[PDB]
């Protein structure tokens, strides 16, 4: 395999043994001013996701050309709300929201992001980017517009003095300093049947299927309750002390973990366990993310969950996630999904999750670092 | 000699020589959410400086009681565009904007601000803020104001997660990593007199006096223009480069170059040299800190220059700073005023510099290292 | 969630952390002098309600326009001699009577009051006024006239140099100082079912309803008698004695507790128990105001009583209320009705309270401070 | 000396150095109802200003037994016009002007008012009431008549909620807050000399005289100009930020600000100063208070000016008493009369302000604080 594009990029190549820790080409001292040339009739365009008109934009351009399945039947639906949580976080930059327009018609067409993030990894704390919601319109794939947005939105990070990014993807590039695997928990069988997410179990009937994947009607963990203002600081020192074991890890300030886990409604969801002491020993998160059913006439969304950062200290991580299936059965959410990353391998069988298709990939950007298992991955990306 | 304050501080001791380089304390997994209580009657506030009446009361508040002269005749006159320049660089939080306010009338009586930035000291590169502006109303000196201040600010900048600061002070204070003397040239010798900046010397005339500083009318360097847009990513190449030879410097990035450097009339002036070859080869920038007369409130000001950050590779460095006091004086300034820190030594008998009262200390908060000559200091605050 | 009114207002932000006790924006030392401009064809109009002509058109714009249930089945009826009570206290001014005309029928199409009020809030005691009978014609409704009386009265206020105001809204604000429940209490169930203000409960016959709810047929409080002019100075006392053990309350002078509670028929009542030895030791009160049944061909009011102020020192406070009641249904009374806020919770259960639906909210202009929960909630709007 | 009814009342003794800060006694909770009882054959009564066979009844009392001159040679002449102006100040009440008849005859003979202010003494801003135009028939004198006076304007001012009043008195009492003297300017200082308020000074002629004290005939600062509607906010705003610096000061409405500066003939003359801008940055004031002249040599009565409340921002202090000088010459005046408080002892001199016999002192009733200098006192009395 050849990479007409990853291999210009200051990135390990595919087959490349890594014994050293370090960037892969020194820091630029001069950046190009001018922002990288687009075919004709196409324009860059920083949106203003504070423009409710200019968000739904947005919106609509990932609602229909964002990721799908490998079988081409689910597509994500970012709400907008989530992508104002998504985007806006402590330190984002209106540049970092880098649009594709077309001139004549002003459509929206292309998309990606850049927000900024404290990232240890390995022994090395360093400031940097995370990338997301690359997008480019179906009716121009192929046609290389992504490079184009890759190397506008390294341009524009470049002129910040940032020089790595951490991102996520699906597909196998140079190169993948970890790779991961899904796993889904159904929450409700019949829905995940019809609409072909998941197929009848073998040797099993409909109803059988549904009293096996059942569960209580409220959580057992004593103290559960969710998380408020005051909760703030003890949730920062948690994550940050329970994160130290793994070796890729953000780093968060007091804000940014009020901004990350301070519930808000269907987009973050963040319960604490204050035991009998009144101490928050700790804590389950998970966001809100559905999908859209396509070609499919009855059933259009699909309401999923998503596994955010759970730190456990006195309450067993069994619990803890058992709590996390219930809650979201409680609150109409379809499937709880999750990736293989920190301790999440550890709870897999037990609490009766299914392996999906397909792996997610970890890479870091112009720097270079020996590989991790999925257990050393400790960064959950949106 | 006791530090009430300052040795409660993560700082060294004065008289502890430091041979490490390294942080105090850790970081902190949690901080106070509560801001720090004032005495009854007063208020935190962040200002909104794009706010065109906060802004206005903060000039005030700064014209009326910031720093003054040893002598106590000269009351900086601080712009309303000035202190936009000096307290809304790349990154500026509007939490950072910390002021005091009585509760009842809403009177603005205290300050004190951080900017972000990217300092390299010694062998470590770390994000940092810089505190700059912290002032108490003359009515409230002396009343342990500044202390709370000084926490409260310590307080907000811990929230974003960062945990060093560098600060200069014209007081001796645990403990000075560098120390600087003032250094002042004549550039309208008659009007700094009949003000009282400069007495008439031993067997001085003045009918001659304006002989001893006289300077050319134009600069002998022959390339010299006004920095331009185009300029931007060499003046970052040229400053990057010049500054690894000191111990303590800004690490910036292309687009705080261009805040800090690209001209704005009566505020910021850079001035590039463009050889016969079309290279931007050396630099010097200077800006603009007008004073008004104590003794005199309504009568016109007393125009200072004060010498920003001046790069050299081609031009030689007495050549550059000659030129620098050229334009100066063209534009109408008074004095050129400068720190002897980085070469600025190399120059002060040569062109006829005399020295000013007082020291300037400069400071790390939460970093031990040690102490280095005032060449080294390759920093410059306002 | 955006105001497009709210927002621009000295008010704390919905959702925000208040630390502090104090004033948003400073006392305004000019004033504009010039009325808002109403949109084309209506004028301004201070109502002069000792004028029988003009309070009867304030009469007829509530009557037909004021708050409805959200059911839209019932309708304040504020009396004329009501409204004169409510509106002409100690200290009303006329040019705080703003109502809005058509400029070519002269027909009163909106409205809004202020009445002066000191004002205790936590540790402060100030004078503000009390913003009430906000009201728009039905045929003028969401055309943005309300910001514009609310703008206006605000003015009229500043020229009497009074810059903080308490109002109530059914409706969420921001940003509410507290939050109160309203609970009714039956008297006449049979009307009270055949009107639909309330519903048959569960598997229980209207006959079993009315005995549910019957009441003895004369007070139980010994020296229970309605207050005269000598009680004035006892009830002044006890109510300021009683109202310092919560966070909001007014300020009464003995002038003011003569208007507000010397009995008037059909407006208000007052009852005071004067004891064995001849002394004042509580008394309770309720003021008089029916609701239009809309659309019923037989009952066409709803006379309900409204819980005032309750003060007790020797008399349970239980025993109280229920005179109260004994008290309200003697006096032909359909409902008596209240907010739970002060004490009124510790009753609710035993004196067969039921809940009503939406929230009343409490709310400071240009004043910051925490919020309280209802029962340190001692202030009563009519 | 023993003060028979001073020594009951919430006042520091003489001789008691005060150097706290508050009420002497606590509010009261409860009022004496009942009107204090006068001696046998006289009675209460409100005088209703707005009768004009009243007011006249009112100005005859005065202008027969109030405040003889130091010489007792003159009598004050109050017009119906000005004590309505005095008297009926926004926020004036009726049952504060306390007259007292005889009960067969319904004759007036003693009077005293209140009117509402908010006084800001020291750190502290408080509701007050002025008290002034205590007058007792001179028939009456020496009976203790004003004792009850005052013992009952105090109980109608404790009814409205206020307990702590203002006044000045040209005798002793428990306890000055600050003293004050009378100076006075010349302006026809041969009618002066005629009616015996001035002698010729030592051995000078009339003809000499005349021209020590000539005035310019125009005003100096040019841009005066009489108050007009549009000048209310702007006047409003200079005094409130120039009484700043002075202890004793009152605290004015927009609207108290047009009912004590906008002009009336005969009554009170403010002219402002609009500067080439266009601003108003400075203003003067006096009130026109004739005495009758009880002889003539020619001459029934002396019109005297009363300096008022003089705001200097932009012009001289000195420039803007000259002018005031002037423009009460040229509208007829015979004598300038003011008292040294505020910035008004420094151009004294130059002036030619001449001293005068006694002394005005300024009293705080229930309020305890440190005595002040007569340039601490911002409030004129009438
Ligand atoms: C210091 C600052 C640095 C900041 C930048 C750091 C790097 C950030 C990198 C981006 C992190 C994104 C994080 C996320 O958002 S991952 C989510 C990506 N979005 C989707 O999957 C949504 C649906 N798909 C599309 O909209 C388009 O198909 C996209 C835009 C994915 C590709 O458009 P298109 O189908 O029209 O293709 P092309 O002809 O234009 O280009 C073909 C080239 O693109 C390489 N390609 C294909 N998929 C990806 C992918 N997900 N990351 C990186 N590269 C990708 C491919 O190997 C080939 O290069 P090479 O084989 O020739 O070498
Ligand atoms: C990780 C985040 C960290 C962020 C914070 C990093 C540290 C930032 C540190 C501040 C960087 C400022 C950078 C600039 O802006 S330097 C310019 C400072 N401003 C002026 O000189 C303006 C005119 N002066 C004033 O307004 C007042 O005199 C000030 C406000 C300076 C002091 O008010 P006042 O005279 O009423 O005094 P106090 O009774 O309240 O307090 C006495 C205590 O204050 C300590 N003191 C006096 N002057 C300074 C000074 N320049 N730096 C640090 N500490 C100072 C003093 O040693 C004593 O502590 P200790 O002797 O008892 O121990
Ligand atoms: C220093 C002195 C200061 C003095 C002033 C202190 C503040 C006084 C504040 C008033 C205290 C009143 C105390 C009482 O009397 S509460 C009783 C209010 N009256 C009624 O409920 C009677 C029936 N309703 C009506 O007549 C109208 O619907 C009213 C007049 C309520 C609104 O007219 P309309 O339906 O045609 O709406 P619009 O298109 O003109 O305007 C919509 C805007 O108005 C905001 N809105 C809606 N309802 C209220 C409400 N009850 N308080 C404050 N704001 C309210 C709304 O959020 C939106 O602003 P934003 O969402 O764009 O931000
Ligand atoms: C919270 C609400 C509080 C409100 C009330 C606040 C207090 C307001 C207080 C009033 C502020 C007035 C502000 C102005 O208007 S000052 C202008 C006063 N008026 C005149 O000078 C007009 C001509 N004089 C008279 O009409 C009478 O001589 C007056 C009425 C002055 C006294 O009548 P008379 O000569 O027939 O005497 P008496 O036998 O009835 O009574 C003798 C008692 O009166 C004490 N005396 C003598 N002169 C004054 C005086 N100027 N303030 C207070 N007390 C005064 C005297 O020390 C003795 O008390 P004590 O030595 O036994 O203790
Ligand atoms: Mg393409
Ligand atoms: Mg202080
Ligand atoms: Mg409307
Ligand atoms: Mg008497």
Request: charged share 25%; with cysteine.
């Amino acid at each position: 395999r050849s990479y007409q594009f990853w291999d210009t990029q200051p990135v390990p190549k595919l087959g490349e043994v890594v014994n050293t820790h370090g960037p892969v080409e020194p820091d630029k001292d001069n950046i190009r001013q001018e922002p990288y040339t687009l075919p004709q009739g196409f324009t860059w365009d920083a949106l203003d996701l504070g423009d409710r008109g200019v968000l739904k934009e947005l919106y609509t351009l990932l609602n229909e050309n964002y990721v799908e399945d490998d079988d081409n039947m689910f597509r994500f639906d970012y709400s907008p709300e989530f992508l104002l949580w998504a985007l806006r976080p402590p330190g984002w930059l209106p540049q970092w929201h880098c649009g594709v327009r077309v001139v004549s018609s002003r459509k929206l067409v292309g998309f990606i992001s850049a927000i900024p993030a404290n990232i240890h990894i390995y022994d090395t704390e360093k400031k940097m980017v995370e990338i997301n919601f690359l997008c480019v319109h179906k009716k121009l794939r192929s046609k290389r517009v992504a490079p184009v947005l890759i190397r506008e939105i390294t341009r524009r990070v470049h002129l910040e003095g940032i020089f790595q990014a951490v991102y996520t993807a699906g597909v196998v590039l140079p190169k993948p300093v970890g790779t991961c695997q899904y796993f889904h928990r159904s929450l409700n069988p019949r829905k995940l049947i019809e609409v072909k997410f998941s197929h009848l179990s073998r040797n099993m009937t409909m109803q059988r299927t549904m009293k096996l994947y059942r569960l209580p009607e409220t959580p057992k963990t004593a103290g559960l309750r969710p998380m408020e203002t005051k909760d703030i600081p003890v949730v920062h020192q948690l994550l940050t002390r329970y994160l130290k074991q793994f070796h890729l890890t953000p780093v968060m300030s007091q804000e940014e973990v009020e901004h990350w886990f301070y519930p808000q409604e269907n987009i973050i969801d963040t319960f604490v366990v204050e035991n009998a002491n009144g101490e928050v020993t700790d804590f389950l998160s998970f966001y809100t993310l559905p999908s859209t059913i396509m070609n499919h006439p009855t059933h259009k969304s699909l309401k999923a969950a998503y596994s955010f950062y759970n730190v456990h200290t006195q309450t067993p991580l069994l619990d803890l996630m058992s709590d996390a299936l219930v809650l979201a059965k409680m609150k109409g959410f379809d499937v709880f999904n999750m990736v293989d990353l920190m301790e999440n391998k550890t709870f897999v069988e037990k609490l009766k999750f299914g392996i999906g298709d397909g792996h997610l990939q970890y890479y870091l950007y112009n720097w270079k670092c020996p590989s991790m298992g999925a257990e050393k991955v400790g960064l959950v990306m949106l």
